[PDB]
Each structure stands twice: as C-alpha cells, then as structure tokens.
C-alpha cells in the first residue's frame, strides 16, 4: 500500500532538511515530495517579493492541486510548516489522508491564525532567539518582518542533537524568512467544515529547545489530535537528529 508523503519545512529552512528522511520513506516503498516554499531553499523568489502567507505557501498549494482524483497524500510539517499544512487542509481537505504536525504550530478553526503565535510569545522569553536578527521589509504602510537565524541559536537551540555537519549545512543554506504575523492577523481563519475535517496527528520532539515540549503538549491538549507520537531525543530538527524515528512514527501514523 504505497503512500505519498508531502514534506513541509519550517521558517528559514528548505526542502533540504528532509534529505535523510526522504530516502528512508522511499526505501520503505513510498512516494515523497519535499517542497521548497517561496524564497526558501533554492526557490527563486526573493523574500522581499513575498508579502502574504498565501504567496509564501504557494509551492505547497501547487503540489496539492496536482494530486489526481484517485489519490490522497500524507502531510508532514515541522515548526512554522504547520501553518502551511493548515492552509492545504482548508483548501484541499479531501486530498489528505492525515496531516502530521511535528514540533509544530497546529491551527485551531475556532481561533484566528495569529493565536498560536500570541500563545508562543506568552510562554517564551523575548530573547529566545539568541543571535537571530530581524528587520522590517516591504511597504512602510504595512511592514513585513524578516528574520535570519543566528549561528548560535541554530547550534544551541535547533541542531543541538545533530552532527556538526548538519549544523554546517544549515549555516550554508538558511535564508531570510518571515512568520507573516500581520498578514495572518488579517487572513480568514480556517473552518471546522474544511480544515477541521482532516485527520490530525502530532509528533513530539522532547528535546526541542526552540519550541519546548510543554508547548507542543499545549497544542495537543487544547486542539487535539487523533494520534500522537513522541521522539524522546529529537531536537527541533528531528528529521536530522532522529530520521529513523521520524520515519517509524510517520509509517505508524499512516498505515
């Protein structure tokens, strides 16, 4: 029974983060699409020409639109990748067998699209991103906010359980990104009819220092998932620190 996994990266990363998980899923016999969102990875757009969350997510939407009538996909997204899942879920609910959120923001159709971020801010210190730097971009009447991950933040708070090779790869590949907060503040929210009809799964990364477990648990407790799994020694980048475990969870959740 072949599955088609669509993998979705978080902010400032790209499809390349899945380079270890993708062959493990293909070895198991499945199809995998690892997408670069706009201005991520080797996607040719520049961040300063991306002003909406919809524009940002468009490469995932193109994958979603090209799934044939016979078919469904399994979605996996980490970190801010969860917001793009939510948009795919709202738009193509019938094309998705299960949406898996790994150490990610899991939207709630009862709240606005900013609420997860407001809740983040509420539980996490304003200095949580260490040497990351932020600057406004776009139109001065509604400015966007871009971020670049600092090498210390990445070393200590994202890749602390990964090899130095993976952290190095990351420093060579990471690009400016945005959480699109003021765009999301104006977006229509997801609905129980569409988004809320899709089966959800959650995978905990217990050693994630950028998105603490009490937080991931809050998502599960306040929104709920049909299936939850935990990877005890995954950092924020569980697909790199624990690719076999992620693959094991993903195959359990799907089969």
From Swiss-Prot:
It comes from the Eukaryota. Coiled coil: none annotated. GO terms for molecular function: methyl indole-3-acetate esterase activity; methyl jasmonate esterase activity; methyl salicylate esterase activity; polyneuridine-aldehyde esterase activity. Disulfide bonds: none annotated. Changing residue 78 to A: Loss of function. Inhibited by DEPC and HgCl(2). Mainly expressed in roots and, to a lower level, in leaves. It catalyses: polyneuridine aldehyde + H2O = 16-epivellosimine + methanol + CO2. InterPro entries: AB_hydrolase_1, AB_hydrolase_fold, MES/HNL. Its EC number is 3.1.1.78. Pathway: Alkaloid biosynthesis; ajmaline biosynthesis. GO terms for biological process: indole alkaloid metabolic process; jasmonic acid metabolic process; salicylic acid metabolic process. Residues 4-114 form the AB hydrolase-1 domain. The active site is at residues 79, 208, 236. 16-epivellosimine binds at residue 79. Keywords: Alkaloid metabolism, Hydrolase, Serine esterase. Changing residue 12 to A: Loss of function. The strictosidine aglycone-producing AJM7-DeltaHYS yeast strain expressing pathway genes of the VOM module, RsGS, SBE (GsSBE, RsSBE1 or RsSBE2), RsPNAE, RsVS and RsVH, accumulates vomilenine. Additionnal expression of pathway genes of the AJM module, RsVR, RsDHVR, AAE (RsAAE1 or RsAAE2) and RsNNMT, leads to the production of ajmaline. Ajmaline is an anti-arrhythmic alkaloid commercially used as an efficient drug for the treatment of arrhythmic heart disorder. Hydrolase involved in the biosynthesis of ajmaline-type monoterpenoid indole alkaloids (MIAs) natural products, important plant-derived pharmaceuticals used in the therapy of heart disorders. Catalyzes the hydrolysis of polyneuridine aldehyde into epi-vellosimine, precursor of vomilenine, an intermediate chemical in the biosynthesis of ajmaline. Belongs to the AB hydrolase superfamily. Homodimer; homodimerizes in aqueous solutions at pH 7.0. This is Polyneuridine aldehyde esterase.
């Amino acid at each position: 029974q072949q599955k088609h996994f669509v993998l979705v990266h978080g902010g400032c990363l790209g499809a390349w983060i899945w380079y270890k998980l993708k062959p493990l899923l293909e070895s198991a016999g499945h199809k995998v699409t690892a997408v670069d969102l706009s201005a991520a990875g080797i996607n040719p757009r520049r961040l300063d020409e991306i002003h909406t969350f919809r524009d940002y997510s468009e490469p995932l939407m193109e994958v979603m639109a090209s799934i044939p009538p016979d078919e469904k996909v399994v979605l996996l997204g980490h970190s801010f990748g969860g917001m793009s899942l939510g948009l795919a879920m709202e738009t193509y609910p019938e094309k998705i067998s299960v949406a898996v959120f790994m150490s990610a923001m899991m939207p709630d159709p009862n709240h606005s699209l900013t609420y997860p971020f407001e809740k983040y801010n509420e539980k996490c210190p304003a200095d949580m991103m260490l040497d990351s730097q932020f600057s406004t971009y776009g139109n001065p009447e509604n400015p966007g906010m871009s971020m670049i991950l600092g090498p210390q933040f990445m070393a200590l708070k994202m890749f602390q359980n990964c090899s130095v090779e993976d952290l190095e790869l990351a420093k060579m590949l990471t690009r400016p990104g945005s959480l699109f907060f003021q765009d999301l503040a104006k977006a229509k929210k997801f609905s129980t009819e569409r988004y809320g009809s899709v089966k959800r799964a959650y995978i905990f990364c217990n050693e994630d220092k950028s998105f603490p477990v009490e937080f991931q648990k809050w998502f599960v407790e306040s929104v709920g998932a049909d299936k939850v799994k935990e990877i005890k020694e995954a950092d924020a980048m569980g697909m790199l620190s624990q690719p076999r475990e992620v693959c094991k969870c993903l195959l359990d959740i799907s089969d």
